[PDB]
Protein backbone atom coordinates (compact mmCIF):
# COMPACT_ATOMS: atom_id res chain seq x y z
CA UNK A 1 0.00 0.00 0.00
CA UNK A 2 2.88 2.33 0.87
CA UNK A 3 5.93 0.42 -0.42
CA UNK A 4 5.41 1.37 -4.07
CA UNK A 5 5.32 5.02 -2.98
CA UNK A 6 8.49 4.66 -0.90
CA UNK A 7 10.62 2.50 -3.21
CA UNK A 8 10.25 4.83 -6.19
CA UNK A 9 11.54 7.83 -4.22
CA UNK A 10 14.57 5.98 -2.81
CA UNK A 11 15.56 4.81 -6.30
CA UNK A 12 15.32 8.40 -7.53
CA UNK A 13 17.24 9.60 -4.47
CA UNK A 14 19.96 7.00 -5.02
CA UNK A 15 20.05 7.91 -8.72
CA UNK A 16 21.00 11.55 -8.18
CA UNK A 17 23.58 10.69 -5.50
CA UNK A 18 26.98 11.24 -7.10
CA UNK A 19 29.51 8.59 -5.98
CA UNK A 20 32.28 9.73 -3.67
CA UNK A 21 34.93 8.65 -6.19
CA UNK A 22 33.71 11.10 -8.86
CA UNK A 23 32.76 14.38 -7.16
CA UNK A 24 34.30 17.15 -9.27
CA UNK A 25 33.27 20.25 -7.32
CA UNK A 26 35.42 22.77 -5.48
CA UNK A 27 37.37 21.10 -2.63
CA UNK A 28 37.43 24.36 -0.66
CA UNK A 29 34.57 25.42 1.58
CA UNK A 30 32.98 28.45 -0.05
CA UNK A 31 32.11 31.61 1.87
CA UNK A 32 28.39 30.84 1.68
CA UNK A 33 29.00 27.35 3.02
CA UNK A 34 31.14 28.71 5.86
CA UNK A 35 28.41 31.19 6.81
CA UNK A 36 25.63 28.60 6.66
CA UNK A 37 27.57 25.97 8.63
CA UNK A 38 28.60 28.49 11.28
CA UNK A 39 25.03 29.72 11.67
CA UNK A 40 23.53 26.24 11.87
CA UNK A 41 26.18 25.05 14.34
CA UNK A 42 25.59 28.13 16.49
CA UNK A 43 21.85 27.42 16.42
CA UNK A 44 22.49 23.84 17.54
CA UNK A 45 24.68 24.98 20.44
CA UNK A 46 22.04 27.56 21.41
CA UNK A 47 19.48 24.73 21.44
CA UNK A 48 21.73 22.85 23.92
CA UNK A 49 23.42 20.56 21.40
CA UNK A 50 26.48 18.85 22.91
CA UNK A 51 29.86 20.47 22.27
CA UNK A 52 33.22 18.70 22.49
CA UNK A 53 35.31 21.89 22.24
CA UNK A 54 36.25 23.53 25.53
CA UNK A 55 34.76 26.97 26.18
CA UNK A 56 36.91 29.61 27.88
CA UNK A 57 33.94 31.42 29.36
CA UNK A 58 32.72 32.38 25.89
CA UNK A 59 29.03 33.23 25.66
CA UNK A 60 28.50 33.82 21.93
CA UNK A 61 27.37 30.68 20.06
CA UNK A 62 28.66 32.15 16.80
CA UNK A 63 32.15 32.55 18.29
CA UNK A 64 31.93 29.01 19.70
CA UNK A 65 31.07 27.72 16.22
CA UNK A 66 33.91 29.72 14.66
CA UNK A 67 36.32 28.16 17.16
CA UNK A 68 34.95 24.72 16.28
CA UNK A 69 35.48 25.35 12.57
CA UNK A 70 39.00 26.66 13.17
CA UNK A 71 39.83 23.47 15.08
CA UNK A 72 37.77 21.44 12.53
CA UNK A 73 35.40 19.35 14.63
CA UNK A 74 32.01 20.44 13.24
CA UNK A 75 29.70 17.37 13.21
CA UNK A 76 27.91 18.58 10.07
CA UNK A 77 27.80 17.20 6.54
CA UNK A 78 27.22 19.42 3.53
CA UNK A 79 25.07 18.46 0.54
CA UNK A 80 26.12 20.22 -2.66
CA UNK A 81 23.25 20.37 -5.16
CA UNK A 82 23.91 20.13 -8.87
CA UNK A 83 21.35 21.88 -11.10
CA UNK A 84 19.77 18.67 -12.41
CA UNK A 85 19.11 17.47 -8.85
CA UNK A 86 22.25 15.37 -8.39
CA UNK A 87 23.90 15.86 -5.01
CA UNK A 88 27.40 15.23 -3.70
CA UNK A 89 28.15 14.76 -0.01
CA UNK A 90 31.36 16.39 1.17
CA UNK A 91 32.27 16.66 4.84
CA UNK A 92 33.58 19.65 6.77
CA UNK A 93 36.59 17.65 7.98
CA UNK A 94 37.81 17.10 4.41
CA UNK A 95 36.86 20.65 3.42
CA UNK A 96 39.56 23.33 3.27
CA UNK A 97 38.90 26.74 4.82
CA UNK A 98 39.76 29.63 2.49
Amino acid sequence: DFQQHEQIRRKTLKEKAIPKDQRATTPYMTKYERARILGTRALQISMNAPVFVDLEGETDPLRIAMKELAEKKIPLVIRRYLPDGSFEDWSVEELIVD
Binding site: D1, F2, Q3, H5, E6
Partner: protein, 59 residues
Protein backbone atom coordinates in the same frame (compact mmCIF):
# COMPACT_ATOMS: atom_id res chain seq x y z
CA UNK B 1 -0.30 20.92 22.58
CA UNK B 2 0.40 18.15 20.04
CA UNK B 3 3.02 19.92 17.94
CA UNK B 4 5.89 18.60 15.83
CA UNK B 5 7.95 18.31 19.04
CA UNK B 6 5.90 15.28 20.12
CA UNK B 7 4.05 13.92 17.06
CA UNK B 8 5.43 12.59 13.76
CA UNK B 9 4.76 14.63 10.64
CA UNK B 10 3.38 11.64 8.72
CA UNK B 11 2.44 8.26 10.17
CA UNK B 12 2.03 6.32 6.92
CA UNK B 13 1.89 2.57 7.53
CA UNK B 14 3.93 0.41 5.18
CA UNK B 15 3.64 -3.28 4.40
CA UNK B 16 0.54 -4.57 6.19
CA UNK B 17 -0.57 -6.28 9.39
CA UNK B 18 1.80 -9.29 9.54
CA UNK B 19 0.78 -11.12 12.74
CA UNK B 20 -2.08 -13.61 12.35
CA UNK B 21 -0.06 -16.59 13.57
CA UNK B 22 -2.06 -16.56 16.86
CA UNK B 23 0.81 -18.51 18.48
CA UNK B 24 3.66 -15.98 18.62
CA UNK B 25 1.82 -13.46 20.81
CA UNK B 26 4.47 -13.42 23.57
CA UNK B 27 8.05 -11.99 23.69
CA UNK B 28 6.93 -8.33 23.49
CA UNK B 29 5.27 -7.41 26.80
CA UNK B 30 7.92 -9.48 28.60
CA UNK B 31 10.58 -7.52 26.68
CA UNK B 32 9.12 -4.01 26.28
CA UNK B 33 9.65 -3.16 29.96
CA UNK B 34 13.17 -4.57 29.66
CA UNK B 35 14.02 -1.90 27.07
CA UNK B 36 12.05 0.81 28.93
CA UNK B 37 13.70 1.18 32.35
CA UNK B 38 16.72 -1.10 31.79
CA UNK B 39 9.86 6.06 32.38
CA UNK B 40 7.17 7.29 29.98
CA UNK B 41 4.28 9.00 31.76
CA UNK B 42 2.19 12.05 30.86
CA UNK B 43 -0.15 12.40 33.83
CA UNK B 44 -1.32 8.88 34.78
CA UNK B 45 -1.12 5.46 33.10
CA UNK B 46 -2.42 2.25 34.67
CA UNK B 47 -3.65 -0.09 31.91
CA UNK B 48 -0.08 -1.17 31.13
CA UNK B 49 0.10 -2.80 34.59
CA UNK B 50 -3.02 -4.93 34.01
CA UNK B 51 -2.88 -5.78 30.28
CA UNK B 52 -0.15 -8.46 30.28
CA UNK B 53 -1.54 -11.01 32.76
CA UNK B 54 -4.79 -11.43 30.79
CA UNK B 55 -3.20 -13.72 28.20
CA UNK B 56 -0.99 -15.53 30.74
CA UNK B 57 -2.98 -15.97 33.94
CA UNK B 58 -5.49 -14.13 36.12
CA UNK B 59 -5.63 -10.52 37.40
Amino acid sequence: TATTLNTPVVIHATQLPQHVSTDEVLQFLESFIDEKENTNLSSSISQLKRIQRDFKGLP
